[PDB]
Amino acid sequence: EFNILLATDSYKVTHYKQYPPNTSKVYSYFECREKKKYEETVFYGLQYILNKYLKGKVVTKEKIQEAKDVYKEHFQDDVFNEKGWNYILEKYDGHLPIEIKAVPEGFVIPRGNVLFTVENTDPECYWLTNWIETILVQSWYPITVATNSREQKKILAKYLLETSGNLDGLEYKLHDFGYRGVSSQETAGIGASAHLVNFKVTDTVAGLALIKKYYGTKDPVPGYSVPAAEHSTITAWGKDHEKDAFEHIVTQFSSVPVSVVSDSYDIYNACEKIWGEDLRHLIVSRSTQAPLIIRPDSGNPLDTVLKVLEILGKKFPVTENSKGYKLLPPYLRVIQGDGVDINTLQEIVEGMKQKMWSIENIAFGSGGGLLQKLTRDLLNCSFKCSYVVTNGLGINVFKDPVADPNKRSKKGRLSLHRTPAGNFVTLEEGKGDLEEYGQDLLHTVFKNGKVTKSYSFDEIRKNAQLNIELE
Amino acid sequence: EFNILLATDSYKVTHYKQYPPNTSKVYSYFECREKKYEETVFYGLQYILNKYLKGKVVTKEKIQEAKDVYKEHFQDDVFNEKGWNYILEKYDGHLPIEIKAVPEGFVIPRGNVLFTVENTDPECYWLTNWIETILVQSWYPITVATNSREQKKILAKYLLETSGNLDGLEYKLHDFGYRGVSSQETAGIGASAHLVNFKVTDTVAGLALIKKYYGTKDPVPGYSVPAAEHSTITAWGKDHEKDAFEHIVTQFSSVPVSVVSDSYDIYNACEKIWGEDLRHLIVSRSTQAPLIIRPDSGNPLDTVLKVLEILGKKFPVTENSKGYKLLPPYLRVIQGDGVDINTLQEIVEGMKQKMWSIENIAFGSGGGLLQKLTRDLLNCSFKCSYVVTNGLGINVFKDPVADPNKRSKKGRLSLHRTPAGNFVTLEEGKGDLEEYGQDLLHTVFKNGKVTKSYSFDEIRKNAQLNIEL
């Protein structure tokens, strides 16, 4: 079972001995710090953490003793605030005396703004605010996946609108293939859920149960997939029988969309000769609702996509849409699912546009690039103490390292507001109390062991919409 | 609760319909495919076998749950209810799968078979690749362990060169990655993989994982020491940095203590606060209880060099037997910002050039150690190499025209020692010719049971550097 007393960075066990004596309040905040592009971030994932790890009775006698035993050996010393944890157990039935205020999930906020704040609600527990830094800071991950996925959606939307005149199918154009490429089962669920803020296609099944349990949707599920081959289901037929494998697979799945990996031996031959000649009669008969989706999986992503489109354009009847771009017949599409990240996605759609191919023709699959190749440094996700009360006096505190102004932190009590022009501003030093800027956009989401405000996944998706979608 | 029917890539739900009719066996293998990182540490499969694959993993409820989810997820009924029910009814929900693997902690060159998977019941031909997704996540502990061991090789080389021995090597790279990984589960797995090579960590999650799944003779596999963070310094107020420092080192007067010193001005903190105002509190400390000064910003090499130059003018420096400068034993430094395998190399080389011993320094690494890694680093990959269809075995493989590096191995595989004592992987069942002695893989899972396992002490022994041996 999970033990909150063992879910912090080891050194934090020692901090209750290090704060100024007579400190009754420690107040801290999280931001995606501005860096002298990712100019705005999607706030998402805190609700998972609050419910799974922070709410209710999280302290017991047994958990205190377990932590005491471990820390004794881990430090080779007895440092451990047993009294402080016993107080929470006895006075609050093991519920954390902490208040967290947060911007609503799904909100899209420019860099350098307060996204949530944390403070103790009982003077005895001044040390607890930063105990839970480690677990709260892991919100960097769903924030960053959601943000990077949304930035890819912006690229897709721009190029889809330009080459086709509309955004039809946009939510189905970036498919999460990252289950095997992330570092754990838990990561898989969190990351997949964050991608579903922006799109509706995933093979990372773990995301669905997370959303159902912690957020919820009106629809039965938040994300969908379609039948698809992998190299094993092609290669198992033997080298000389790739055509037999293809025929078997498209016939088994004759009335739904089906994706077929086509580069086991020679992607160009498969497209031109197997699909384009031997099995053409099985492709041109398919429904618009059940296309064959050809899947290259190797070679230079841009070069390969363009050559695949060139081959198919010569074997199948291509039309020219009203924007002047070429379009494959509706029973035939392509998905590029190798080597896709935000940079290569951009290169591919631009290369397609230059060669006059509509983005209607293609979808992308991304795995490691979508869910694993991301770090806390990307958006400078960071949690810092900005205000303490010592001897009954509040003081505004901060760091400001001489050699790195980008690491300077905010001072005092913070609040988030709309500006007169409709943008966002973070007010420092308790200046939100002057009430010159309308209502604080942070809301209490957790107080004294209870989750006090929750969002559905539908609301989160609404908050995270692109401007181009709004228009 | 975890449900293995919902722990696969969605498309694999449809694969049982795509293999050749009358296929009775699908045999697959994992490697770190060949193209830096010429050898890999095999670590972490035992966690996966125990946490997710062993025992009764199928129930009627789990089957019904999966059926209901996939019906909506595919907008169609494609789920193999009958196949999963067969496992439930015939094997009381235990997986009819056999997995063979190299011993954990083994250090093996790229492009070798590391583990193999096959079904033990013909009805369950589809099961081998169902579990690809979950087994392939072994890339992560393998890659963490490998990259951590590569950093240890660098530290060993330079510590040996500048000090003449390896004392303290296992205390030289401290895991600071708890907040910088993607989840609680990842934190435990990754921290455990780092502890294959080192003994210092703040990622507490790793301790319980090791205790539960591997075990050590010692009470714990890893250690930490008291240390400040910016909040415990800045909370005192900007004009009271000295007071914070004095309080902290007095509270921790007889154990090592690390104190972040760059809240406002690292160079002032070192030269004036530590080097003058509080000097009397530092020079009085035990060798067993040094102050460890922690810079945390600026160019990592430039800041380390300048911090050392400052301290060398304020404290009595000696010259060790190798001719390198050494701070007094009550004073050390830890660089815990911007450290990854590349910058670690740059810092120790730069110290060596300025005649500073690597004894003086330790490193902390977080995102660089546990998060900034992907499955592409070592090309960790699971592929089918052998099937039986209509009673006939066939050697199968992919070999994409545009990327020879993605070619996979053919047929039944085995791992062997060569005459020169190296590793070779034999394909096409050739291990059976018995020209290369015994298969070095061991059966580790069979029919719902873990059949071979390793303690964390044995894994550490397997993972030792040549220089340590």
Residue numbers in the entry:
A (entry chain A): 8 to 43, 53 to 487
B (entry chain B): 8 to 42, 53 to 486
Paper text:
NAMPT functions as a homo-dimeric enzyme that catalyzes the rate limiting step in the primary salvage pathway for NAD synthesis, the transfer of a phosphoribosyl residue from 5-phosphoribosyl-1-pyrophosphate (PRPP) to nicotinamide (NAM) to produce nicotinamide mononucleotide (NMN). Crystal structures of NAMPT in numerous ligand-bound forms have been reported. These structures consistently display a NAMPT homo-dimer with two essentially identical active sites at the dimer interface. Typical NAMPT inhibitors were found to occupy the portion of active site responsible for NAM binding and a tunnel-shaped cavity extending from the NAM binding site. Furthermore, we determine the crystal structures of six NAMPT mutants in the apo form and in complex with various inhibitors and present a definitive model to explain the differential effects of the mutations on various structural classes of NAMPT inhibitors.
